[PDB]
């Protein structure tokens, strides 16, 4: 019977630094992995208040993506051992965030460990000046490659003064044991900040994520 229950909790710890500013975050989350939604509460436990935009940290929990039965749910199937991911975010103004993560299931809940480093953000840019205010919905394009599941997305952070600040995101998600990979598909995601204290040292988020077949192009109908 099911390792991943219809309701699952998680704990997460991140160690990070952005433009030299070190910090740690601890959090706990919960959600319904087969329905595709989840929430999390994070606390900046060291290094607060952060001198940069929370939004670059917000996308740093793929067990909770709803999948139709005909798309292998590779990352759920990886449990209880779990999976790792590695991510590069290349922001439009040259800032770069790298992230590594380990996901496992221990004592009936998910355990997440994250390490993050951001560098090369302009001192007067929207990240270091805290001038973003959330992200738009996105669609992560998922595809098998090099024995892992890759995702590619273009994140759009909303600027306080209107307009967007963007990042090209590439992630590699790899099960700790060989698990059947899906074919290429798409995950529609929306992530909201649902609560924060005045200096964003306590932040709560809600995410909805659902996999579907790729829309495809007209060209493919002639194949
Ligand atoms: Zn039920
Ligand atoms: Zn500092
Ligand atoms: Zn609750
Ligand atoms: Zn310290
Ligand atoms: Zn289908
Ligand atoms: Zn735009
Ligand atoms: Zn709260
Ligand atoms: Zn706010
Ligand atoms: Zn205020
Ligand atoms: Zn084509």
Author numbering: 5 to 64, 69 to 231
Passage from the reporting paper:
Recently, three OFPs with novel phenotypes have been developed: permanently fluorescent LSSmOrange with a large Stokes shift (437 nm, 572 nm) and two proteins photoswitchable from orange to far-red fluorescent states PSmOrange ( 548 nm, 565 nm; photoconverted form 636 nm, 662 nm) and PSmOrange2 ( 546 nm, 561 nm; photoconverted form 619 nm, 651 nm). LSSmOrange and PSmOrange have been engineered from mOrange and PSmOrange2 has been engineered from PSmOrange using directed molecular evolution. Electron density maps show that LSSmOrange, PSmOrange, and PSmOrange2 have the same chromophore structures as parental mOrange. It consists of p-hydroxyphenyl, imidazolinone, and 2-hydroxy-dihydrooxazole rings.
LSSmOrange was shown to be useful for multicolor imaging, simultaneous detection of two Förster resonance energy transfer (FRET)-based biosensors using a single excitation wavelength, and single-laser fluorescence cross-correlation spectroscopy (FCCS) imaging of four FPs. Key substitutions in LSSmOrange responsible for its ∼135 nm large Stokes shift comprise I161D, M163L, and W143M enabling the excited state proton transfer (ESPT). These substitutions introduce noticeable changes in the nearest chromophore environment of LSSmOrange. X-ray structure shows that W143M replacement provides a shift of the side chain of L165 towards protein interior, and both W143M and M163L substitutions improve the chromophore planarity relative to parental mOrange. The χ1 angles of mOrange and LSSmOrange chromophores are 12.3° and 6.3°, respectively. In both mOrange and LSSmOrange, the oxygen atom of p-hydroxyphenyl group of the chromophore forms an H-bond with the side chain hydroxyl of S146. Rotation of the chromophore around Cα2-Cβ2 bond in LSSmOrange, arising from W143M and M163L mutations, causes the change of S146 side chain conformation. The hydroxyl atom of S146 now forms two H-bonds, one with the chromophore and another with the side chain of D161 (I161 in mOrange). As a result, S146 acts as a mediator for ESPT from p-hydroxyphenyl ring of the chromophore to carboxyl group of D161. All elements of the mKeima proton wire are present in LSSmOrange (cis-chromophore) indicating to a similar mechanism of ESPT; this suggestion has been confirmed by site-directed mutagenesis.
